[PDB]
Symmetry: none
Subunit: 125 residues, 2 copies
Amino acid sequence: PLRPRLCTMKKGPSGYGFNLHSDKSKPGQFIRSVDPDSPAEASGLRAQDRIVEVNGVCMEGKQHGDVVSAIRAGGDETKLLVVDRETDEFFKKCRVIPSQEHLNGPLPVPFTNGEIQKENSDTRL
Amino acid sequence: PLRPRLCTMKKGPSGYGFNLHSDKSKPGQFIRSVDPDSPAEASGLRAQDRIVEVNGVCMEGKQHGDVVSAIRAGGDETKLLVVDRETDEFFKKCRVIPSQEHLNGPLPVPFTNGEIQKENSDTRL
């Protein structure tokens, strides 16, 4: 497969029904669990997904509470852009942060080992 | 023990007979003094106790004036849930706010340093 997935869900009587986890061992906010028959599960959210965007705003580099505040501040609805591990394990090789562009359109091309061997440092100024 | 204590007291001609203190050095509302032969002392209230609930309403996170106004608005009787200094340090190590449930039920299990060393951040959504 290897594309990100957008999860649109509406708050139920007791929330969305999933668990977000993060720790110092790795970067990123991950779905530890999703309750059965929950709004989160119906939208297509699954365990071990990593949150990339919350309602069209990028979450790369932000802390856990920032993502949590971003989700709680969206009202009774939220739209999460998420990637599974294999899709996540692909985009780092492209060195590309996933976005809404990748839901439909052409996917990036990974970098070869020889290109990383060059140890290039490039900056657009 | 290590459980909290409920202090039910009725206003005397000159109040309950205790003084409440707080300052910037520490969070929480603490009992600095309790008069002898006072309604507060008979109920079991002691100095250095920290107030957690006022008439079944938790006060964790509240300001000093909020707790005072809550006590004055309860009429001439009040039920205070309090913890001594030692009890407070145990619920902190458990990361659990005491409640009426800890008057009777099983006490929580503290977090180990290795689990806190991981600095995990989990959120129910």
